[PDB]
Amino acid sequence: MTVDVPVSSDPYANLAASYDRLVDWVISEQEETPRERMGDYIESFWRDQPRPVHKVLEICCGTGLMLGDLQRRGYQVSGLDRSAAMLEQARNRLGTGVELVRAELPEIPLHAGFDAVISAANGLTYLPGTGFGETLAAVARLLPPGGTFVFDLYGHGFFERFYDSAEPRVLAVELEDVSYIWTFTAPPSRAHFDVVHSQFLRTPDAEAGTYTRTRELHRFHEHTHTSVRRLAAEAGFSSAEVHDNWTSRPSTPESMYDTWTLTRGVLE
Amino acid sequence: VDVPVSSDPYANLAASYDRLVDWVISEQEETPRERMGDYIESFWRDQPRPVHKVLEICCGTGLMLGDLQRRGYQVSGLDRSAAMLEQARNRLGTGVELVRAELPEIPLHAGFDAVISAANGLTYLPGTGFGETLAAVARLLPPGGTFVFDLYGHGFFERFYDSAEPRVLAVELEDVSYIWTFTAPPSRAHFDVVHSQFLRTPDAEAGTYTRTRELHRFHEHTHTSVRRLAAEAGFSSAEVHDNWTSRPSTPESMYDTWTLTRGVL
Ligand SMILES: Nc1ncnc2c1ncn2[C@@H]1O[C@H](CSCC[C@H](N)C(=O)O)[C@@H](O)[C@H]1O
Ligand SMILES: Nc1ncnc2c1ncn2[C@@H]1O[C@H](CSCC[C@H](N)C(=O)O)[C@@H](O)[C@H]1O
């Protein structure tokens, strides 16, 4: 339909069952960092901090790809996501002993503290500026002095790559049992950035060649370096560094993904 | 999942083709039929013999023929696709002669003042059938009669077959979504596009689509080859320009427009 696709309460509800396979493709062809290398970066940062990390929360934990990596390294992990469908996959991966809470950021209905909080593979880009700042504030209240918060965002280069003309760009891939078509549009103001995620899955109990299309609107926000630094300071983080895509290289106007390392200050 | 060449690659596309052409025009530099007709008419007005009877081979759904019909020419069409010709018969009416045949066969029993082929149908012919088609067209024309057609230019093959991984292009249109995958063998003897098409399923609940996949197999005919085959067919002149303009053709051209003139016997 040429008419606009509305924003659903859970844009991942139809994707959760095929998400892990799609991640494999984004890692191969769209520079997304493997969760093992994200974990290596996170652990290296933690090892530079004076307080040891044991309890870890991931917000926007999705199907648990990042949490599963940390579980295998020996951490006591917990997850939060707004999508029941994603969390069902995470439950299968992590087992029944891991706490997984369904909540929509900036709400974090957890009272006990964590030694560290993370968010991998760009979930925080779904938050508008106001809710992003409130999420940083909520994460700060879970951390002790010196505790860390490590997350990624789409970098400036992502927005310039996929929103560079009045005419929308289209990206597609055909995988074994699913075809995806992504159409990227943004308002003239560029206040947010939309992707229509069209997914074609074979229709069960139907003649060969039959597919069911579902469409979901994924609405992204660019959080600039200057805004992230301001909101981190407001939330009570005494330092905030950014690097290019889970490496030690500087973040630049070309970066496709930015990786933020925040340290909680000493004022409660 | 490999796709073979169908006898009619356009059978599943004919019903959606005119709308797809609107998108190619707005995004892939295909020339509107009115501007192709303008170019053709300007070329004809440089010839000493007036043009009235016009045949288009690879006439498809009749978009080019409809433009010339509007201008007053007596038009005829040839295409191998019954599905495409059904659309052409709707646009042009029942009085226009439309013949189903696969080039190089042209089963017609009278000549034309001019022959055309618009929007790159002749790129589906390999070298041998392309040369035989030029020979068949020459035999429809009087001395000095002209043949105007387009081909994919060198820039098209460079743009879509240079990457280390096969290029994928896509769009969602009205009731149909397309994914195109561009591959070529190492020999580069031909150039393939797999046309993966999701078309709404009639009488099914909303969101049901039927996928069909068609192989479109293209050939690059170099300028040297075209001039050689034009000479062999009996054309005395053969000029090439960039995409239906008077600008010269270059290695960067996406579309080449050929203007051939039949020689004297
Ligand atoms: N406001 C919000 N509150 C909670 N979860 C959110 C959210 N906005 C997006 N998400 C979640 O962000 C996730 C992004 S996909 C990333 C999943 C996982 N971290 C991984 O490494 O693969 C989705 O599961 C989505 O449901
Ligand atoms: N060998 C062949 N013989 C006859 N028609 C052919 C052919 N190879 C390709 N075609 C036809 O070439 C057409 C290309 S599409 C172009 C259609 C029309 N000239 C227009 O201006 O839109 C299709 O209709 C296809 O069926």
Author numbering:
A (entry chain A): 1 to 268
B (entry chain B): 3 to 267
What sentences appear in the manuscript?
In nature, S‐adenosyl methionine (SAM)‐dependent methyltransferases efficiently catalyze this reaction with high stereoselectivity. This study presents the investigation and rational re‐design of a potential methyltransferase, termed SeMT, from the actinomycete Saccharopolyspora erythraea. A putative methyltransferase from Saccharopolyspora erythraea NRRL 2338, henceforth termed SeMT, was identified featuring 56% sequence identity with both StspM1 and SgMT. While its three‐dimensional structure elucidated via X‐ray crystallography confirmed extensive structural similarity to cyclic dipeptide‐processing methyltransferases such as SgMT, its putative catalytic center is clearly divergent. Accordingly, wild‐type SeMT displayed minimal activity with diketopiperazine (DKP) substrates, triggering an extensive mutagenesis effort aimed at iteratively enhancing this methyltransferase function.
Crystals of SeMT belong to orthorhombic space group C2221 and contain two copies of the protomer per asymmetric unit. As expected from the amino acid sequence similarity, SeMT features the same overall architecture as found for indole C3‐methyltransferases SgMT (Haase et al. 2025) and PsmD (Amariei et al. 2022), with the putative catalytic cavity located at the interface of a Rossmann‐type α/β domain and an all‐β cap domain. The two chains in the asymmetric unit are highly similar, featuring root‐mean‐square (RMS) distances of 0.55 Å both for 264 matching Cα atoms and for 1060 main‐chain atoms (least‐squares alignment using COOT (Emsley et al. 2010), using the prevalent conformer for residues with alternative conformations). In particular, the demethylated cofactor SAH (included in the sample for crystallization) is found embraced by a binding pocket that is virtually identical to the one found in those enzymes; this includes R82 and C60 essentially sandwiching the planar adenine ring, D81, which is hydrogen‐bonded to both hydroxyls of the ribose moiety, as well as E58 and R35 forming salt bridges with the homocysteine ammonium and carboxylate groups, respectively. Finally, the characteristic tyrosine side chains covering the cofactor (Y12, Y19, Y126) as well as the histidine‐acidic residue dyad thought to participate in catalysis (H218, E216) are retained. Indeed, while the catalytic cavity of SeMT resembles its counterpart in SgMT with respect to size (417 vs. 378 Å3, determined with the cofactor in place, average of chains A and B in either case) and overall character (hydrophobic patches dominated by aromatic side chains, interspersed with polar groups), residues at individual positions often differ notably in size and polarity. Preceding a regular and stable α‐helix (αA′), it features a more irregular terminal stretch we have termed the lid for its presumed role in controlling access to the active center during the catalytic cycle.
